[PDB]
Amino acid sequence: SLTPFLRLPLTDLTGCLINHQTYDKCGKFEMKMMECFEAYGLERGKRECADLISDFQECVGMQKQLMRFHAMRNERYKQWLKGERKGQEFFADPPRVDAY
Amino acid sequence: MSLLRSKYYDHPDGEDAFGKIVATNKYAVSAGVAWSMFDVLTLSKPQGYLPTLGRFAYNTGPLMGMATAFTLTTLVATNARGKDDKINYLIGGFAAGGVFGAWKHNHVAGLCAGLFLGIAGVIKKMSIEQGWEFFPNTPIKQYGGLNIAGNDWTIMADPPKNWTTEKP
Amino acid sequence: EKSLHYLYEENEKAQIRLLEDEVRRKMSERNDYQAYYYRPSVAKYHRISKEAADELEALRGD
Amino acid sequence: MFNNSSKILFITIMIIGTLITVTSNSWLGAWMGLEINLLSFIPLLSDNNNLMSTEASLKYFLTQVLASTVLLFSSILLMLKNNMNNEINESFTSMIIMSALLLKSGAAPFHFWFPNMMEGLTWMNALMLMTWQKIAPLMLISYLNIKYLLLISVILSVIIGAIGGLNQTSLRKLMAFSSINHLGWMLSSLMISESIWLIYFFFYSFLSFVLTFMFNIFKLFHLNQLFSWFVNSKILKFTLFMNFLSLGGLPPFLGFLPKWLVIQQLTLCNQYFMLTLMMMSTLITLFFYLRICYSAFMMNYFENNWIMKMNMNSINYNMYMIMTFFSIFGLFLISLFYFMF
Amino acid sequence: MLKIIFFLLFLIPFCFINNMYWMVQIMMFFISFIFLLMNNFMNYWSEISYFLGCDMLSYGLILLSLWICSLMLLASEMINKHNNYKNLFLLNIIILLLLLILTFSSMSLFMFYLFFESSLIPTLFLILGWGYQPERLQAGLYLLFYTLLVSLPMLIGIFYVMNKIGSMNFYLMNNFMFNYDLLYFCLLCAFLVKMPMFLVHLWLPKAHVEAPVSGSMILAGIMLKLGGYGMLRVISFLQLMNLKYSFVWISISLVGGVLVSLVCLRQTDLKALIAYSSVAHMGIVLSGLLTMTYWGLCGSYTLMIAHGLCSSGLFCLANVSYERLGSRSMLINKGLLNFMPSMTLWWFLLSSANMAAPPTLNLLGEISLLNSIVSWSWISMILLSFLSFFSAAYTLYLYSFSQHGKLFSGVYSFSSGKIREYLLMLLHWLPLNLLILKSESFMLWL
Amino acid sequence: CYTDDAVCRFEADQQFRRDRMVDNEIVNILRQRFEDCTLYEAPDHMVKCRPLM
Amino acid sequence: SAVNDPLELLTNKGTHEPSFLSPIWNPIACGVAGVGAAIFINWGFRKPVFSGIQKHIAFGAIGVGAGAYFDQKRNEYLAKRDAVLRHYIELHPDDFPVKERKTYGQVLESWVPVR
């Protein structure tokens, strides 16, 4: 997170505006990152919390998961265009709707 | 990852030619396109599709002439004598001033600009051989005065933290 | 001897100024101390919102 | 402020919105504080008996609304890519945030609204525009560690704000171009030390706040109104015009001190070339300061004959002469200060 | 130097009391008397109290500045009779005297820089307020901008030296030495413009012709000596870069002073010819400084003090004849011996002092500054002989054409010489002939 | 003397200056001895003043 | 001292006696500034300079009180600054080590001769 410059009582309302602590799956990870952002600081936290920043980033931004999914989808269509994948067996078996 | 993504000082001076031409013309392209973008809308509006590109070429192409003439003059002066020094950059600045004089049809501008760009060249050569940097990364960056931790004035109470300095 | 005393005072002031220049350079290089170059970030508001969401779980119902 | 208590209410919501902006730990709270500040500053600067004040308010509105929407756009993009409030490594969306902040602050090359709008104002709203409305965008620039874009803004601001102020003989546009030139010294201090920026801003606002009072009381909207300005003693006009040499950075006045602390902190942080570029800039600023100083330094003028007595407010001229003393003999307080250690 | 500074600080409220102009002059001459009795200074820094102290160099410079400012009040009587803001003029003189004492009593270089830039403001006030021509605005702007354009990067040099050494004290900075070209150019170009080199002189005749005598004397007698005293402080730790880059400044400052001396032969203005005369002799001073010999520094300081005295004395004569003849030139002021015969004695006694006058301190400064230039190289002999020959060619043309020949036959009746003017001319000449008996206080600063 | 010490560089510089002064009137006194040899041996200074030279 | 220890360099032993103007200069300068400000107010309103001495006395008292208070705040600020510098030196002794003092008898610098 950022820092309050010349901080006053007026930042107490602003500080709780957008955060992941309210019933989100990622917020505990965010909380851990905030823990070292309270310990190391905002400037040492950019270097000594590279593991905790990236876990929160690909937990709420879902960058690596969506790149993985788009690599899984593009390879199947690439195999269909190259002729290795038959058009009848192009898609696999669907999941149950009660699953997930 | 191409020949366009090259710098002027990626090689020693006089060793490489085309990368230096591409780099110095790239700064010439950036300066000319920026000045012509703040030119053709703001003062002397061309009011046409073709005179706008004409003003773009007028503000861009002589800067390519400056860059190419300075780099070729520095390359010739480096390949002529064994030693590399400052007056190669001085005569390259005079060649760029002569290009300015050919642009503006005024010899006096060509000389004065040659003297100014030669002074700029010898100062840049002093920078590259003495090791100091024109715009270095800032070593000392004050984010506040003393007691930046001690002037937290907030009315809400702090909940107890989840981190300790104590070793387990 | 007044020149000797003033030279001793100015030489010690120059030495302390050089020492504090190296101390400030090493402090701003690594952001180690809380005083000068520390940009403070607090996890107070995240803990406040998580605590408020924890009290709001008890008040859900009818 | 003047003639209404609702203007005091607008000043109160102005202070509230700016202090909401600068204390925000998120870009969205800073953005809504800028919305509150814009809401507060539209009604001051609007007057239906002035045909150009409404046009100045429209120019301010269009410039701030365009700059606030780009600021929210790149803030949302920063939250989209790097999901915290800041960015670990600098990228282009930080440059878009900095550019949208530079349009609010009035720095070059996004400076063009600022002296073109200052012709439509009074002097008190000019002082609120070029001092307090530069609190919120300049303090938000401090969160961004960008060197090339800030350096380009510094060089362009000190080049243009010195060169551009030579042509105008109107005092409002000249003082706006002076505020553009002093903005470059603030932005040059913004990437070495935030405290040194605060000190340069406080002393620049002090010198602005004492030079506004000489123009607000006597209604000096032009350069030759200074030459026709009547004083009961020419030594008093000689002393009152020393604040322009203070704002030009000439020692031993007070305004040498913030420029000097910026130069000292820049040389400690190993910047020398843009400091030398700002040496040549402030000579031109001192040059168009001296055309005002022609009106008091020659000690005798061919003056208009009909006016015989000068008139001033009580409390405004009482508060003016406290600070004119400290804008001349302010370097005797160099031992009292303890911020710079 | 706290007693002198507090003496002038409580001499400040005499400006606001009316009819006290000559009282301020009397007490400033009393300051000069006390400062004559304060001489005990040697090589190092003595009488140290709250960052203030002096060596023999700074003692002579403060004594010269005090003598020039007291004479300047004696010189400026047209302020008193016309009541042309005499209180503001007195306050400007006393504040500028405080600033010049404070920039000469500086133990660290940054007080020298700070009060050196502070001293530009009352001189600019004197130019813009107490001149007589419409080109006052061209004069003070040239002075202010030619000083400031080169004195602003020297602040960056000062902070570069401070970070490297950590202090600005002149003895602690003597130990170190630097091999940076741009640091040398910053620490030299401000003094190279402030005391006029031939390529950068321009501001000097514009500032001198326009300026009032109380304003031309502080530009001729002192405030070119700031640009010599600055090099006397700075060249101690930049000896290697000075040996790298002296020859261009010695060549420029020796060709100028011949070209400058040929300029004065082809000029008709009386105040402009002394203005270019300040360039030629401090061309010798500038040539002798950048040769780091012991005789060069000693004779340079001697010619600074003595040339300041004789140039201020020569600018005293150019305002006596100006206020009687309405406007000064060679053509109007031709042959003033038949008008003022007793003024002609001081005219020759101070115009001869501008060249080599035999028992004066100008010759003793010149005879030892030629020693360093001759010992530096033998090529410099050709352009020194022409320099001194053309120097006494022009400075004898001043007295020669202004004080001999037929009258103008178009002038009106003016007042004769007074007791004030002869006393003013005496205190510029007899210090030039009386300090040679103890010239070691004006030779040996080391 | 040490590198950072300035209280002892002042004393060493002052005794260096004083020794330079002392040697200056050593050479000056020897020159006056040669000149007094030249005046006192007015027709025969080519023999008596050669060792003093 | 054969070594230049930063702990021994920074620790105030007490051999530096403060000057006569050291506790008194800021209140008298701020009082002179307040008296001059009231004089400047009376001059600009075309009053006599010493007409209203109530303003002179009030401005002088405000100046002396503000000078004493901010001089005390300055003294605690400088004490905390040197405490911060000392604690940072003891926190990282590897980056600020004990250096051996090296005399001129072991150093060959390049002298610069003129000729």
Ligand SMILES: CCCCCCCCCCCCCC
């Ligand atoms: C006009 C005179 C103002 C000063 C009066 C004396 C003030 C003395 C210093 C303040 C008290 C210090 C106590 C330690």
